[PDB]
Design a protein around this nucleic acid. Sequence first.
DNA 1: GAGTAAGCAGTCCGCG
DNA 2: GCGGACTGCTTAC
Length: 903
Amino acid sequence: MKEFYLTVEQIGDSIFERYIDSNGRERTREVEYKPSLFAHCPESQATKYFDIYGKPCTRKLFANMRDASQWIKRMEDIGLEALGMDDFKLAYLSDTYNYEIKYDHTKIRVANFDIEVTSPDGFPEPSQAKHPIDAITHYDSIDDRFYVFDLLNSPYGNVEEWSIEIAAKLQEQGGDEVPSEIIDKIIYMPFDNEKELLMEYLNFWQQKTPVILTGWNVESFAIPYVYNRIKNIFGESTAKRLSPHRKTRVKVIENMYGSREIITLFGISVLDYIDLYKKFSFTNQPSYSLDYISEFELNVGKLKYDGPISKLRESNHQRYISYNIIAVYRVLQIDAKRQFINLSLDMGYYAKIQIQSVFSPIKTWDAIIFNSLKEQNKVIPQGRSHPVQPYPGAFVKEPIPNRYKYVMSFDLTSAYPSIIRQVNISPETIAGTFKVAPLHDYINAVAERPSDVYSCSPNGMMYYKDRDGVVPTEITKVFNQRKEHKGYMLAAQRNGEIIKEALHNPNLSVDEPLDVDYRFDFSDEIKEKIKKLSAKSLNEMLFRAQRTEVAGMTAQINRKALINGLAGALGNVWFRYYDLRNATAITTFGQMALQWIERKVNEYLNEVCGTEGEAFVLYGDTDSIYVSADKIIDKVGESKFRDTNHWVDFLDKFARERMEPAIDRGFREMCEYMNNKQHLMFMDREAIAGPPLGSKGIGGFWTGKKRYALNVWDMEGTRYAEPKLKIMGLETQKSSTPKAVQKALKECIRRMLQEGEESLQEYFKEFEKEFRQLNYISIASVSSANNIAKYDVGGFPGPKCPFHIRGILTYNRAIKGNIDAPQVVEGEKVYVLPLREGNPFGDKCIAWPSGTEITDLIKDDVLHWMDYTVLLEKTFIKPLEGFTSAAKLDYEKKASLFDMFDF
DNA sequence: GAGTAAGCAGTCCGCG
DNA sequence: GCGGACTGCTTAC
Ligand SMILES: O=c1ccn([C@H]2C[C@H](O)[C@@H](COP(=O)(O)CP(=O)(O)OP(=O)(O)O)O2)c(=O)[nH]1
Ligand SMILES: [Ca+2]
Ligand SMILES: [Ca+2]
Ligand SMILES: [Ca+2]
Ligand SMILES: [Ca+2]
């Protein structure tokens, strides 16, 4: 097989690489790597190395990596550019794997682990590690085994062995309900003292050395706790055995809020799953506890136990160990669904970076572009310092706040990357400039055509048509990968809907789910069988379909993120190819595009409807337009339609057969106008929205920019079995809005959009009537707790103190001297509740860590003093007021002359 | 060390 | 009691 790297590190003048050899065996090697860098030379000098602008360079081959670094300094002291890859492990990887990396995941050791630590004195800080590590579950992807390290004897209690028989029993049977599919995979190792447990853990670590190290919060908790604990017991160099190359760094992160210390284990690629989740999932959760995310991603119940975690090992060791094991499994289950480890690996090897560098689009693209240019013997520029400057982004049309009955939306395929490719925007494709007209002049086709010769953006930039830039070339490769996966996700999504329609009439027989590939639209024959299947079979199929759609989602959305990342990175000063002319070329072309096509669409629709100057485009943002289809519908008359699906079919056909061509024609003209390399402005229909036919539903509404609601029947070709709400920006979409209020507001919106004013009024009355009976957590607000110290004036609120911070300060005072009350962590999320005046907390609000029940010592008082009135007004009524007034609708029956009668 | 646009809640402060 | 300037947080794209 072809060889591929596992990890690479630079240590002095040495490259340390773990790799898989041709026999598929894991190896390590120290390499005295001899780097190269480049200096411009005169034209007189024969060379095969040119920089990106075509200037000749001379190769400087250094005897070691320090030599190359010193040379960079000397070049700075002279005032001349030092060209080439300055991150030597990237050059090494590039030189060592000069071919497309084909990797095999079954040879890559992936470790998932979680430790337990009993603490009678509050949170066990990793930097101190003054408490015994009393459990470790470590899952090894190559043995496919959960290795369990269990401390029986500890200063905090001596316990009996954990029972695999009891762990496997149902909870309702006194057992721990450890999932059956992993019972046979547990290897249990009890220990009578800490020292032998850790020694045995290290010895096992050397034998099964992680390549990818993951789990939940491993980077901030488990890894540094294990390191510092081993350090304190055995010494630093023993703790250093956690590194395959016996090198570590007690690191520091430089950002915006705080000052922490994590451990860099050299020769290991750490991907804390919480970080993967935050980057790749595109959710913002009110909490990031594993219980919460597990419930969210998998619909498994919260791991139940009695009393604090600081007493769990002693009161119920049986459950303590089982839960340690289950928590490890849960991350594996989330990854089986989301597939972020697979994605990370795909991207890492594609770019030829250290795998942990997937968190940095900038690093990722620097490597991709470097490897691309090197193939053509081109020499990359030296990174330069730049001052941070703001620059303009997208256009957003101010919408008229209102209800909007029928709406058809259209949006450009991969807009920013497509602009890059259309205009040929790259550092080396710059041809010059032209004198700009005001933007509106391009929008309205009155401005002098920018160029006969070059490809242009209305920002003033000109690019070569006759040659490809490394940016367009490489962004196109990743775009095409993205396209393929979106194709799979949408097919699976459509297949899902075929299955949901078939569940309306489930057959009564014993059958099996069909062996199909959900990535491709079901054949007619498959559709026929589906119509005969049992409910059991169908639901299993729906599950499989939905798991396929999730996988395509992960793979498509994050390749999209990567390419969109390339466009944004051009405006980041740390990017080697930083250039505000290129960044601005994209955004400004985007602004023109959106407003250009708004004009063309109003023109076209006025023409086909035989009217003039009517406004069909009601709203737009970045690359999207929203079209009022009321007149399209009135033109034919609502009477002519059989059911809802009939008119959805009409507008679908209208968009595809009439509008899109007119849109295409409009953009091809703009392409010619800007003399672009390639026409790539593809604006496909997104949503088809309206009320159910015959209903009092209002279809949709806008309250302002980025704030709207649509009852959608078809989305990018997916015809839903049931209408689905498309809500953007409104409180139901915000993680700060309480759970039960999101739910309540959404149901209000659903009623407005599908049923009408009377239905809405009915529901509102009920909610206000019953809401006081909701669980306090479900009605608590959520906020990130940033810069807490800044507003802490002797335990009390300082000036300009934010509401949620004041609650944190209220919490701190009420738990002062409470030994095991959970401390709020700076930068993390809290629940927040308003308090009635005269409460025994002495302030107007309280806040405690999200995802957790509030400590029982102050829960009582919180429940008693919660201010339901304020909580409803603030989170529910006031947003609902915004929705309804914009929609010209009432949530409560207004007073009227009819009040004089008895109905 | 991907980007900008833009909405809403809240504090401070003015207002016979 | 509510506006406007201000920060903080959060979303749409
Ligand atoms: O996180 C983001 C989101 C958007 N955009 C910019 C760049 C985006 O190109 C642009 C439009 O945003 P969408 O309509 O959501 C996306 P796109 O067109 O990428 O992908 P489709 O083919 O529609 O799934 O906004 C960003 O720069 N960053
Ligand atoms: Ca735990
Ligand atoms: Ca788009
Ligand atoms: Ca059937
Ligand atoms: Ca869009």
